[model samples]
Target: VNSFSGYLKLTDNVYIKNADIVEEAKKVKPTVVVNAANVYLKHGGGVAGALNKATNNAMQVESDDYIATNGPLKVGGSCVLSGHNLAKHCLHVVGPNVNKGEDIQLLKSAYENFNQHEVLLAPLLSAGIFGADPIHSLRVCVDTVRTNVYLAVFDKNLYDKLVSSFLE
Candidate 1:
């Protein structure tokens, strides 16, 4: 709680904070919760996995239809799921898998591909298993999304780093 003062301003309509992802999601109660998911929507790992587990695999069931209709999604692609536990809907974005400091442009591009929405909650894309830098990922999230963006942060060190960078 000390790490963030509710919502730290980044840009107009964009807000970020360091808090539990699910806790933030519940507090904001956004229209959609965007999961940093893979093409398969495999909710067995990362933020996506946690979210899916929270919602009792509802996202996976919804994703099945999308996969069935359109096949596997591309790295920069997105999908939506309705009737979720946390939010009204959940949006899944296919994040890139790359080594640290590599494919920075590709990682940015993946986040940029997301369509704008009214109220969106998203994690820092590619910062975990995808190996992108958290600060760079935050920049991409702020840059890409135009409307209200509520960023959920888990790591205290990363949170401190992000807060310090923004303050500086």
Candidate 2:
């Protein structure tokens, strides 16, 4: 598949794909998790422009489908968040966009407690709006705290990848 301005040519073809994207989603684990909760939002980054999309589950965010990935150039249908190229487990924390207010404490805890010795899977705006830019957000996450964080997208493969990272 292809999108934006380029193409991704792959070799060979396969069938009987994994149709259960939600099953894929369930694979993700949470860091500082709270069920049925919502908070403020902050934004930044190359993709931060599209950060708001992450909130509206129907509008910008869609469940159980391909996801846009930052594979290499962040290219082609390669942008589609699916297939083998798929990251694992699409864990998400929708509290405050970039990282502000109460989120600061929560993020600190996750990093200090859960992610202290290990890496974490998180998004650019992990700190709420403070984490909108990947570089800046990550720095804030690392410096203010002491954990390795990765991008958390809406893909199950992404969740799996993080789980594997922690286990390792």
Candidate 3:
């Protein structure tokens, strides 16, 4: 099976990839894989939805547990979930919807919390169903996190665009 892979080295330790995030998640197996969830912990769309499917529905169960206590989890706030079928752990970040004009701040906050891990697999927060501008989202992802970062890219065009943007 053939797949696409590309990366832009933001620094010696931090890099972004334009490949299947889930596929990269499996290969890299970062200590923590981020989930772009809402306060309700609904893993029904975007990266969270796919992560749920790939992890054999384990993410949803963990999400529910956190919701039971810290439910309606505020934007930028996160809860760690046991990575049953994925990474060593999963960080569920309350990603905001761009339609609401508050995603950038929320995404920045979400990125801030996971900056200490040795390795992190982060989604393009608010870039999917949240309607965030992908380019801007990429910039924020690079700017805020202070650790080794792997950005999972599922779209070939997006991958090319990211690479192009970095080159210029």
Q: Which is the winner by lDDT between candidate 1 and candidate 3?
A: 3
Candidate 3 lDDT by residue in tens digits, 129-160 = 78888878777777887777777778889878
What lDDT, from 0 to 1, does candidate 2 have? 0.29
Candidate 1 residue runs with Cα over 4 Å from true position: 1-5, 100-102, 113-115
The regions of model 3 sitting more than 4 angstroms off are 1-7
Worst ten in a row by lDDT for model 1: 1-10
The superposed Cα distance between candidate 1 and the true structure at residue 27, in angstroms, equals 3.1
lDDT of each: 0.74, 0.29, 0.76
Best by TM-score: 3
- The residue-by-residue lDDT of candidate 1 on 3-108, one tens digit each, is 2238878788667777878777666667778888887777888787788778787777877777898888887778777737678877787777776334566666
Kindly list the per-residue Cα lDDT of model 2 for residues 83-136, writing each as its tens digit. Answer: 122222222333233333443444433333323323333343443233433333
**Rank ordering of all candidates by lDDT, starting from the highest:** 3, 1, 2
lDDT at position 167, candidate 3 = 63
Go through the candidates in order and give the clash count of each: 0, 35, 0
